[PDB]
Design a protein around this ligand. Sequence first.
Ligand SMILES: NS(=O)(=O)c1ccc(NC(=O)NCCCCO)cc1
Ligand SMILES: NS(=O)(=O)c1ccc(NC(=O)NCCCCO)cc1
Ligand SMILES: [Zn+2]
Length: 257
Amino acid sequence: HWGYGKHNGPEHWHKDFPIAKGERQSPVDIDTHTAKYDPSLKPLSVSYDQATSLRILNNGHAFNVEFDDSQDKAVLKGGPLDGTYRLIQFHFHWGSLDGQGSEHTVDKKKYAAELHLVHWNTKYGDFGKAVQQPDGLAVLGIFLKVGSAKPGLQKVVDVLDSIKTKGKSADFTNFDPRGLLPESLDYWTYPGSLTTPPLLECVTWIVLKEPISVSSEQVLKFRKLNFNGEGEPEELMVDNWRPAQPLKNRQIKASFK
Ligand SMILES: NS(=O)(=O)c1ccc(NC(=O)NCCCCO)cc1
Ligand SMILES: NS(=O)(=O)c1ccc(NC(=O)NCCCCO)cc1
Ligand SMILES: [Zn+2]
């Protein structure tokens, strides 16, 4: 099926997912000078105090930390959003080298990795219905650069040995996603898509200006994961990012000047 190799990578996805060539595909390059400041944008409201993480899963393309989304326990509101969006999972995209790995770029700059905190609009009842709607999801994207360690990431890093291969899951309770946030919640926003098949055009993207810094050892541990299942030939889970797609008829808005 689809993946990030030579024969199934992003340039091939359109053959099974023709929306790959659609009008609101993600990620994009964020040209910071042509983004328009919008004073009518509200600050983001991140309410993660009651978040309930449940488990961590290697799905063969990344690893997802999954949350209980059966109540308004961890929600995103405000910003460009109307209504309440519930956190369902977070995951990352990263590179084989510190010089690449992010999906969004900032004036063509690639970061070492990118965190996606995935939320769905509660007016649609569940994630499966939300992805069928143009305003169904809100993904908070946070860039990772290599520098000092991020202490709040370490519990993620340490469990990865237990989910090395595709299909492996592990209990992962009591993780606080607030430990992954930068100091500032200044953001860019634009309408886009899932960045993996099925590439559905259902996402309000909210990309934070301020990256978090993680240590070289932390991101090295991401690169020890496998795309393959256990007992299959080993292919390191690296470069699981889609490159920037045409902005087409879209304007990126900034919450800041
Ligand atoms: N459009 S897509 O989803 O990126 C895609 C690309 C390749 C394939 N299939 C494929 O490569 N099959 C042959 C695998 C031989 C490697 O052992 C399926 C889907
Ligand atoms: N990288 S991203 O744009 O934040 C993203 C988030 C969730 C998903 N989830 C997903 O595809 N789930 C499969 C079932 C719903 C799609 O029919 C995919 C990509
Ligand atoms: Zn993602």
